[PDB]
Design a protein around this ligand. Structure first.
Ligand SMILES: [Mg+2]
Ligand SMILES: [Mg+2]
Ligand SMILES: [Zn+2]
Length: 600
DNA sequence: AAAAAAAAAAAAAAAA
DNA sequence: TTTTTTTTTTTTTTT
DNA sequence: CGGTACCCGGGCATA
DNA sequence: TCATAACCTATAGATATGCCCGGGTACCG
RNA sequence: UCCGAGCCGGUUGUCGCGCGGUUCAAUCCCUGGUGCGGGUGCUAGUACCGGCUCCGCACUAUCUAUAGGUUAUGA
């Protein structure tokens, strides 16, 4: 089940107008922000430093010890022998790291609450980063060493004469991933390039499971692949390949959210003794700082507010906790037909880039939510110029652009990165101390809510108070193609669920290649009209653009004798919606998917 | 009269 | 789903 | 000039 | 190929309670 | 490196149409939404409904950090 939810509000309204408490909140998060930032660098610095002897077995204690050592130095006196071992081992490096970046031990008190949150949060990033991206980068490395992208040019395409190469590549990849045990005679059939890659992969000391493929092994214990993941990054840098962030770094200097709980409240905000705090109710202790009468703190879906918030000095995130907390193909419309038949109105939506949502219904009405509307309404495009403009006024672009790559794994190269970051750290700190930077992150959230809230309001007025949405399954989720821009594709499947609007998926195969007025794809043409390129930089280059969103049908039955064009023009997105309605009506009527739209 | 140059349409490719 | 690049052909001009 | 006792507060472990 | 901001998409986590000890205040021979 | 949305046309359910005309919407400040009432003015029509703004109450909205692709800027 779902046991949590969040309500985000502004710092001004969330807290009572008390500068003494408000200033303490800003000061505390600022100190915690520095510890989190330096802790990530220290963890990376320690790992690179120890690469000369052996890769350490990183654990939650490793991050926790670094956090304490950065703040308290040698004053940290843990009593668990497991942690105390890390203290002595990590002590030389933390002091070594501090002398390079010039960090001064804040010696903050009442740390354990913040340290625990950062310790777990930082360790969480290690799990996620290595859980899936390790497989992606490892497979990418195989493609890059063989220069597969270049192989398609050096070898004939679209022929069986070279299907062996890809069949060969699949066979090699299985051996590299240990998916299939190689035979003893297969080794002699390896060219020097193939043999070299095999040795390089063997140097990773990859874990292995005899029962299931490697992909399942990574999920079972992602941390076991951490030494391999760091080694893989070294190979990328050693051959000039586009480097990836092997170890996550909290690089951003913009004030980041810091979690504040009940314990942190009385220790740092109210600054009362623990003995006094425990004698008061949890809610009553918070009412002395936060304005719980605000709309943000109201309970929802049986989840009440318990003391816990994350703030960055501009916005406050209020978390609601369910009492049952742990305390330590169905999406496709093909199976949801019964619900659709009882829907008041059925809306078909075809996702695209310029027209993020293009909507149509059986009545024939149309509605779209273009990217330009989102950019103007959300203000991200408008904020971008101001964000870049501030750099020109303060001259910070000249500084950031020269920062050495943080993705590097060589200790000497990484040492330069820290030194260069320290060179202009003070100047950038003043620039990022401007409330504008955090204000935009908060204002962008308000505009984003308004733009998405107005989207539902327009759709409700356009199609009715209640309707069911059938959307295509196409999505560039985390796989945006080069050029173009990122667009919300799978996020709508969640947004509709937030508004309790039923959403179902539909296969788009051949939707954009059939004329609805004749139900035939035999007379559909593409990319006929030419014109100067719409993108101004491409236009200045003199390159030509062919219309992409315009499709016409040349079948005589669709034509009228008076037309000199010879085509019945259609909008690309409108064809898909009309075809979807035909598909939906066929399924709703009980005839299933039309043959013309069938893959078979 | 023969050899060479500007432009249109088709296609691949993206990536694990 | 959308752009870019190349290639092949196709059409035309120069000498 | 040294040695007990009560008690609070900081700090750390852990499910 | 590199640096900053972001938009989107995916993962994981979403606090609280008890006990050690050592030093302050008080006193006696 | 540039961009709002709707409508009448050139059009035929047509183009990121740097095609024309036309209606209202947003530039700073703001957590957004639905219903149930009470209380300020601001615009028609033949002494009275609707939209815009606050009050309070029922529930509705998951974010933070990291990473991958891309984008704008600076090299
Ligand atoms: Mg589609
Ligand atoms: Mg489309
Ligand atoms: Zn047709």
């Amino acid at each position: 089940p779902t046991l949590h939810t969040c309500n985000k509000t502004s710092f001004a309204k969330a807290f009572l107008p008390n500068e003494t408490y408000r200033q303490r909140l800003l000061d505390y998060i600022a100190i915690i922000h520095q510890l989190a930032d330096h802790a990530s660098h220290a963890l990376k610095f320690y790992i690179l430093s120890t690469s000369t002897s052996s890769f350490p077995v990183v654990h939650e204690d490793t991050i926790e010890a670094i956090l304490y050592l950065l703040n308290k130095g040698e004053a940290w006196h843990p009593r668990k022998e497991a942690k105390k071992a890390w203290r002595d081992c990590l002590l030389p490096y933390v002091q070594r790291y501090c002398q390079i970046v010039g960090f001064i031990h804040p010696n903050l008190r009442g740390e354990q609450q913040s340290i625990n949150y950062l310790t777990v949060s930082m360790m969480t990033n290690l799990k996620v980063n290595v859980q899936e991206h390790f497989m992606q980068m490892l497979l990418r490395y195989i493609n890059l060493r063989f220069d597969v992208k270049g192989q398609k040019q050096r070898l004939p395409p679209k022929s069986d004469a070279r299907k062996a190469f890809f069949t060969r590549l699949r066979y090699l990849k299985s051996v590299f991933l240990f998916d299939v045990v190689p035979e003893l005679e297969f080794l002699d059939d390896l060219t020097p390039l193939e043999s070299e890659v095999l040795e390089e992969i063997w140097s990773l000391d990859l874990p292995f499971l005899p029962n299931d493929p490697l992909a399942y092994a990574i999920v079972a214990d992602p941390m076991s692949f951490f030494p391999a993941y760091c080694k893989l990054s070294g190979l990328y840098e050693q051959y000039g390949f586009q480097r990836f962030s092997a170890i996550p770094l909290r690089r951003s200097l913009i004030q980041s959210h810091v979690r504040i709980d009940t314990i942190i409240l009385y220790q740092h905000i109210l600054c009362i003794t623990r003995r006094d705090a425990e004698t008061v109710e949890k809610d009553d202790l918070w009412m002395r700082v936060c304005n719980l009468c605000t709309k943000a703190f109201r309970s929802r879906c049986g989840m009440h507010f318990e003391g816990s918030i994350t703030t960055d000095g501009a916005s406050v995130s209020v978390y609601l906790k369910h009492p049952e907390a742990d305390k330590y193909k169905a999406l496709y419309v093909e199976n949801n037909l019964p619900a659709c038949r009882a829907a008041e109105n059925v809306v078909v939506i075809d996702p695209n880039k310029r027209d993020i949502l293009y909507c149509q219904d059986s009545n024939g009405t149309t509605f779209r939510y273009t990217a330009n509307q989102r950019a103007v309404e959300t203000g991200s495009r408008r904020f971008a110029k101001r964000r870049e403009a501030m750099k020109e006024e303060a001259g910070v672009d000249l500084i950031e652009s020269r920062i050495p790559s943080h993705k590097t794994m060589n200790l000497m190269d990484f040492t330069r990165y820290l030194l260069v970051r320290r060179a202009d750290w003070d100047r950038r700190k003043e620039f990022y101390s401007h409330p504008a930077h955090t204000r935009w992150k908060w204002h962008s959230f308000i505009n984003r809510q308004k733009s998405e809230s107005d989207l539902i309001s327009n759709m409700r007025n356009k199609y009715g108070e209640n309707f069911t949405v059938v959307m295509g399954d196409w999505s560039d989720a985390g796989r945006t193609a080069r050029f173009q821009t990122s667009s919300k594709t799978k996020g709508w499947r969640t947004l509709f669920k937030r508004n309790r609007i039923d959403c179902f998926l539909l296969d788009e195969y051949k939707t954009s290649s059939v004329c609805p007025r004749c139900s035939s794809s035999e007379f559909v043409e593409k990319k006929f009209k030419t014109r100067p390129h719409s993108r101004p930089w491409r236009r200045r280059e003199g390159k030509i653009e062919k219309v992409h969103g315009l499709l016409g049908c040349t079948n005589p039955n669709c034509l009228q004798q008076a037309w000199t064009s010879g085509m019945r023009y259609w909008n690309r997105d409108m064809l898909s919606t009309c075809n979807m309605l035909l598909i939906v009506r066929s399924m709703l009527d009980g005839h299933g998917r039309p043959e013309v739209f069938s893959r078979s």
